[PDB]
Design an enzyme around this catalytic site. Sequence first.
Site, PDB file in Angstrom:
ATOM      1  N   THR A  72       0.827  -1.194   0.000  1.00 56.20           N
ATOM      2  CA  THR A  72       0.000   0.000   0.000  1.00 56.20           C
ATOM      3  C   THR A  72       0.869   1.255   0.000  1.00 56.20           C
ATOM      4  O   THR A  72       2.035   1.240   0.405  1.00 56.20           O
ATOM      5  CB  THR A  72      -0.932   0.007   1.211  1.00 56.20           C
ATOM      6  OG1 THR A  72      -0.156   0.053   2.414  1.00 56.20           O
ATOM      7  CG2 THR A  72      -1.795  -1.245   1.220  1.00 56.20           C
ATOM      8  N   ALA A 120       5.408  -8.708   7.480  1.00 66.26           N
ATOM      9  CA  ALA A 120       4.693  -8.226   8.658  1.00 66.26           C
ATOM     10  C   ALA A 120       5.384  -8.661   9.945  1.00 66.26           C
ATOM     11  O   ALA A 120       5.637  -7.840  10.837  1.00 66.26           O
ATOM     12  CB  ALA A 120       3.247  -8.721   8.629  1.00 66.26           C
TER      13      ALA A 120
END
EC number: 3.4.25.1
Lengths: 254, 245, 210, 218, 241, 234, 245, 250, 142
Positions: A72, A120
């Site tokens: 993103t 992550a």
Amino acid sequence: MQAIADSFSVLVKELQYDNEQNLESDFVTGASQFQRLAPSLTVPPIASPQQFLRAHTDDRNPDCKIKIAHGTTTLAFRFQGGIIVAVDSRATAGNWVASQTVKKVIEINPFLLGTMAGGAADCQFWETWLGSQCRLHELREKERISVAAASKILSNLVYQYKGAGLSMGTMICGYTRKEGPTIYYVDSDGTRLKGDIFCVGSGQTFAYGVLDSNYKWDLSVEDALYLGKRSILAAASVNLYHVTEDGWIYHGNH
Amino acid sequence: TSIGTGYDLSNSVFSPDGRNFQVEYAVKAVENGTTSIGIKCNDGVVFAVEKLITSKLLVPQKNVKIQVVDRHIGCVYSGLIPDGRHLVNRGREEAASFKKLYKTPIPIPAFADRLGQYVQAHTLYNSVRPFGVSTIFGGVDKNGAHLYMLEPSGSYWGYKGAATGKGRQSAKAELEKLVDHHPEGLSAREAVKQAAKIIYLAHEDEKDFELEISWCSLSETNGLHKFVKGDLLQEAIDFAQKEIN
Amino acid sequence: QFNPYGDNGGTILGIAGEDFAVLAGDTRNITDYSINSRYEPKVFDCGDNIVMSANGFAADGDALVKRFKNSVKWYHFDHNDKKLSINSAARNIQHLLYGKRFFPYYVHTIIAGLDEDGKGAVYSFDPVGSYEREQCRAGGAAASLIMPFLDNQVNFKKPLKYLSVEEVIKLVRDSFTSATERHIQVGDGLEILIVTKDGVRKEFYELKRD
Amino acid sequence: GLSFDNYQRNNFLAENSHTQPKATSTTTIVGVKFNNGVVIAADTRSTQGPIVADKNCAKLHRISPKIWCAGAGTAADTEAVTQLIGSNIELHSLYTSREPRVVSALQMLKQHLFKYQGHIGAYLIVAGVDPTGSHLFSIHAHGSTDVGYYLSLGSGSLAAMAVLESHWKQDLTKEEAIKLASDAIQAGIWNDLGSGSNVDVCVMEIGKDAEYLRNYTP
Amino acid sequence: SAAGYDRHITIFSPEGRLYQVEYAFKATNQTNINSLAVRGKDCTVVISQKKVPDKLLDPTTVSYIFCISRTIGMVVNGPIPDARNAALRAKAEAAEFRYKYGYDMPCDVLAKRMANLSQIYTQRAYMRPLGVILTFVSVDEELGPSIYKTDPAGYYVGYKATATGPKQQEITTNLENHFKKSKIDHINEESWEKVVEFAITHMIDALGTEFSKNDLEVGVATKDKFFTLSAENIEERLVAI
Amino acid sequence: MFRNNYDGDTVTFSPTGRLFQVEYALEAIKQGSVTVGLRSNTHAVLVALKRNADELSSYQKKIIKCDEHMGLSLAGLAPDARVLSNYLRQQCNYSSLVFNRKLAVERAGHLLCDKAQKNTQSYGGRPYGVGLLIIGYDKSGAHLLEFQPSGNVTELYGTAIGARSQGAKTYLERTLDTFIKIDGNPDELIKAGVEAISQSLRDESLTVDNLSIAIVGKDTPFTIYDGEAVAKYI
Amino acid sequence: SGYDRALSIFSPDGHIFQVEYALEAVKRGTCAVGVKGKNCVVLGCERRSTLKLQDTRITPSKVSKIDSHVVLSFSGLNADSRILIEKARVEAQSHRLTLEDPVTVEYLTRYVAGVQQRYTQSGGVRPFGVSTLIAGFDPRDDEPKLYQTEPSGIYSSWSAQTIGRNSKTVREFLEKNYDRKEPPATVEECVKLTVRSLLEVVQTGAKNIEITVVKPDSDIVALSSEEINQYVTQIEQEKQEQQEQ
Amino acid sequence: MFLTRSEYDRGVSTFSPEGRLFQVEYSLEAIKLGSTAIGIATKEGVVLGVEKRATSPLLESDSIEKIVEIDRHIGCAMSGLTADARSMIEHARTAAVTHNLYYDEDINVESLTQSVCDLALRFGEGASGEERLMSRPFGVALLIAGHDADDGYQLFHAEPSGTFYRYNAKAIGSGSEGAQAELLNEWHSSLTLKEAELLVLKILKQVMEEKLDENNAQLSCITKQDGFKIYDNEKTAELIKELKEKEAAE
Amino acid sequence: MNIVPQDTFKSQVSTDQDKSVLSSAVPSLPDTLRQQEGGAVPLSTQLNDRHPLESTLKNWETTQRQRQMEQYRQIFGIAEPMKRTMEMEIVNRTDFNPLSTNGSIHRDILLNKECSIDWEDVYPGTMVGDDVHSKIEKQLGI
């Protein structure tokens, strides 16, 4: 001499429990595994651990695959009196229901922030570790740690494991009294850059163009927030963070 | 002179006469221990221990002075209890390792040699201390019955009859008399009775005591090491009491 | 080259209520097109009203559960038998998973319990350690056949907050029955653990394989 | 000991743009045992690939004044291993104040070659005499040894072995043994392109000094 | 007696002496037994005196002669614990030599090895010498019958014949007189039994008052094997003068 | 005077053959308070009299839980007691983890003896100076062990260690068969133990602050009662 | 008494005598004074009178620059000061490499104190018999920093501190002439105060005084002989004028 | 029956004839050479107070740091050798930070005190069986004041012997006897924060030879909503003036 | 009873595995300056692309020594390996020569390498470190 006699006195060998690390990791002699400031990472006892990991990480349960932070658009800029960090809150489909928004920004301290833009687990783990290191440094020196010091610590840490398989790119943004507002970018390849404007993600050229159109040092808080929101929208639900000398403040859409 | 000043404050040191005084002090510590004897009969060994009476709070079946190293080996000691326990543990480990490696019970001479080497290794350095225990052990193997005694210096010998402790001199005299009276051989039960008699005679000093006896013979115990049941123990005690008075 | 990994199938589901949590799993252990066991639990009571389940490679899940239980035991020893919270347990599991970053566990982990306030809490863990708190999570090779059923028969915005434990159990049973009908791997049993302030309760249902 | 540095750099250079320079790979070697001693002979022509480099090469190595050997394979490895074993043998003989034995050198060479798991490319023929008699052994690069009466090695070893099988018997004299070894080396020279020029000979007899002959054919 | 230090470790006294080594040397005569080693034409004979003051002691378990290997035998003068320690170390050294060099260990090489170990003990501050004297006897394939003695000081030397014990001077003088008379550095007999009888007679005329079969211990080394005689063999040798 | 020259360390013997450092370690036990242990065919209990520094201070914890079926009480030094309790906990954890097997009381005693003996023969480490009372329940039933830091362990029906502990020992010896045959009634055994420890008091009274109890049984896991939980036994 | 033979032995009154003996060894060294000003730090050092044949081009200086903003003077054994200075310089460079920031004065003082403390934690090592004064400014900061470190590993922050031989007289002079409420405003006043403090003990004067002045933004200046001579002459002239009337 | 010299008080691992380790006693004697530290625990927070001994007026007023922050919810006061206290404080801070990293929660004050005592036990065999780490025991005593949800506000006293106690009010240092007697006489469970602060100041003034003011005494407190905070000079001076006025009035 | 060395690979890694060389500003990270290795050598690069024979050669005499100790334990007992290890440890610990790396004569006598030469003997083979004080600190553990 007693230890020497016990070494040559006779099950534990097959269990591999004559080694300190095995006993510590299995929580046999105590909870000393959860007391290491520098964590210990298991590596396969083979001649090619890196190739082994790379081969086994590309093979097929969707749930048993290493989660990767989505590419993103992330934006950051320092105008006059703080750092604006803008992200897009566009969730991805999955087999779960979220009780809150996805935490695409890691809160290192009440004064430091970071972005995932990579793996992550790696980002979360190592930024929590960096927060602990900064807290220990502040306790020792009785003064807030400089953003340069934190970025350098993270860069050295990720460089020590260069080529092992880590994948993370973060933006450390912080406002200190001695330096002002500073933004660093730390990559998993050991790269460490210092900058005034940073744009990353799947689409960032449009956001960078929008910024360059209407960027100046003599901005204001509201103007900078509007500019960040407009840049994120043009690159496309825009989460904003304003970092001042007193810490960071979060805005859902304002 | 039994007190060598200037040559007795460290372990591995020779006196001007060529003596190690720490080993002699360990022997003196042994000499104050409880009296334990062993008799080698025709086809086995018998171990006897004088047990001092204690508080009634002790569990009778969980405090046995005679230690068993292996199914065919019996062992008693006089001196320091921790050192005796340590030596018994080492002997059990050696016997188990030998049986695992060579698939046969360890012969008594080999066990004695290993134990003596381990004991003697503690008189070579100043950072350790000689064992304050003297150990009388024995058993039965393919070659027959063997009985050995091991000293704090690491010196062990095979004996027809051995005795250690406070009442070692009287027990040794009785053993010599028994050997003289039995030049050809001695049976297991006669050995048990004589061991009971010697243990009862050795207690000349006020304090009540009990007696523990243990057998290891081919004819009786089938080569294993066993304790004494009620009937034989009572018979031996009665014979010893009759011999006393 | 020796291959240290494997796969044993199985499906698990964790749901968080308003004052309770539910963790269920199918009790069938299978190798490739063969049934190893028709009853092999994959959800365990890991101490202070916390239920944990690692799905995927069975050996890795068993090892992770064993390590976590030992860590909880030492935690009780160290701090006056203090009760371990669900978030602290989640961070402990994150550290346990990331300690094998270069030789990862081949499991997906779900834990459930009650938070400090008393609401139900469910945490989900990827194989390397990354975790987050979710209202509902389905893992295994039936999630695509279970999540749409739940989304159709309930709303997470009948709102999930007003559901009782019996309704949640009924929804879980219906979803697993549908998955058993549609999916070959799922079947042979379903074990459900319910965590409330009174503790952990276990229920079992027989699926369509006997 | 031997350094492993620049291994990764060398691999990178080989895999990207550079070619590692080659090493000399040494050529007939023969050993014949007669009733009162041994004879070890070797060819004297050394070629750098398809081009002859020298017409007189000394491929006979000395371990002890009465224990000699000839090696094939990597020349540097052969020379280094022989020199190291010779130093060890000299030290052992000084320590024991006795004449060294062929079995001791054989044991040292075998253990050293087995230590490196065949990464040292030396294939040796070791002959000698000692108070126990005359001995002849063959040593492989992986650490395996064999005992024989006549041995051959090198590129032209098949022709030499054929000659040895043709004209060998239990009772042989020094001159006959030297002639047989020379004939085997000559056959290896003529019928193979890896051998040429003259022959180096070393004769070791019981109770006599070792005799070293260079260019026996002229 | 040492003044300051040297009562514990092995360093130089002001006179330039090692007192601990001398005390270890003195400790070798505590057993009060004597041993004698002689060389035959193709054999070596060692004879030691057995004393059993305690009638409870088993005579068969008392011995100071050890079989280091097939060809080498050893006689130890001194306390039995250090004797057994030295015996085990000698066995290990001989086996290691055979493994490493591909042929049997000679007697002189083993003596030199034990002497080097003794030098280590005499120089290191935290190690003590063993208060024993070692005598290795064998028949080397290059030197014939061989006797080599090593002491706690680290000194080893070979002997045509030797005798060690509390009364070694008498036996040494008698052997020297015999060698001067016969003008031979060995015994001119082709059978080891005659050499054993000669050694028994020499021990009898040196110590005096004779002895029986239970007061002696005999070991014979040939070119094939070293062995130790039993009571019957010793008695039969005693019968033949 | 002559004893002063031969008590330097544990590797030195006196000319008479005595090891004075181990004796001093044994004498160090009397500096602690009194603890009592007693068991029947079904249950085993420990009673401890705790001490505080002053009025504003808290009381020492003399009872430590090692495993769900085994515990101990201390008398003597604090560091050695901490070390030995941690060692026993580690041993129990290892046994349970590797075999899913409860560690036996006799095995714990043997491990403690082996660990303690090694400090009485080497240089650089003083012997332990703490006596321990270990209660447990295993497949062989209820067990009580007394551990003396010289490296000794004794199995007995009841005992007491610490300062002025002879009165409790005499009381336990006298009323032996009375408290032996108390099966299925833990309260009676606890009351017997409290009465036994009351004989060792001197110008002090058992209160809810200085009294601690521990109990283990067939269906009862190792439980510690402190404060109001012991108020019914006073 | 008998408690001064090791660093690991407490005395009955609660003192470690080897630390006191290291301080005694320090007290023999040449005097070293440090004075903190309003915007500068002045380090003065007493030098022994140079011999006629001694070279005066290559002699090591008393004041050493650990870093471009931090200087360090010492008193005690001159040989150990080199080791401490080298370790401090290496640590400063390592910290700059690892954290991209130059060390603070307190960080370097703490590192030196830690090294000195670490060299007191073994019986086979000897503590450094050196007491040090560390002066400087924190990076991008205008606050003068002066610290004192002792052989035991203890460090303190001072406004004016004298160490070495005859340091009590200079300390009393500073206590009677320095007030923390009114530090000297200019560099010249600080230098004059340091010179006047040193002249209490220095027998000759300008040829036995070395002065280093540290100012923010890494301004370290070592005064030459002529400047110190000018200061000494002015001070002597003022003293003579004051004593005349 | 002659008077010789006994040498059982020179080794940390040598027992006295009665079974005592005199090196620990001598370490406590070394502790008694430090300045006075007083801690009072109430239901509204915990108050710590220390005395500053400036051997020279040229010493910096704020250079002396006898009160440190182990963590936001844990503060400490020290008496004795500062070099050993530095290592103890570093270990405590590391333990607290590591516990926060691995458990995402605050560490209990008793857990931190136990960790510090386990570190202090390193002159012999460690709790988990580690070998010796230091040649001699520490010469520092610590007063650890904290607040946690489990046990509220807590005050602990930690000694080099490896044993810690829980105190309602405690005093260490040179003037420990008189301060402890005053604390025993003047403590009750209903004390408030200001009452505890005034009592600490009064006892410090009593046990200090120098006149009490803002430059030789330091006060700090720990509360639930504010954490651990050390008062500045102005607040302490105001408290001292209020105490003087109250004393003069009564 | 091993002939070729086994288990030469690392099982775990960390940033503070090298305890001797650790930073003081950040104790959890290594000190690159004092390592003096080149400045661009991460630890992970040491886990891949190594010569297969390097591990075999680096730990070869240790494996033979361990096999010999095991044989002694099997045949002679615990006492023989205990005594051998005790003697070797005493000899190794007494020696301290900061200016040399060659082993002592007594060590070679105990190892039975008085008249033995290998390539290690022939080939025995800055800004910071490599001085006496660093070796003293390493030896004493301070």
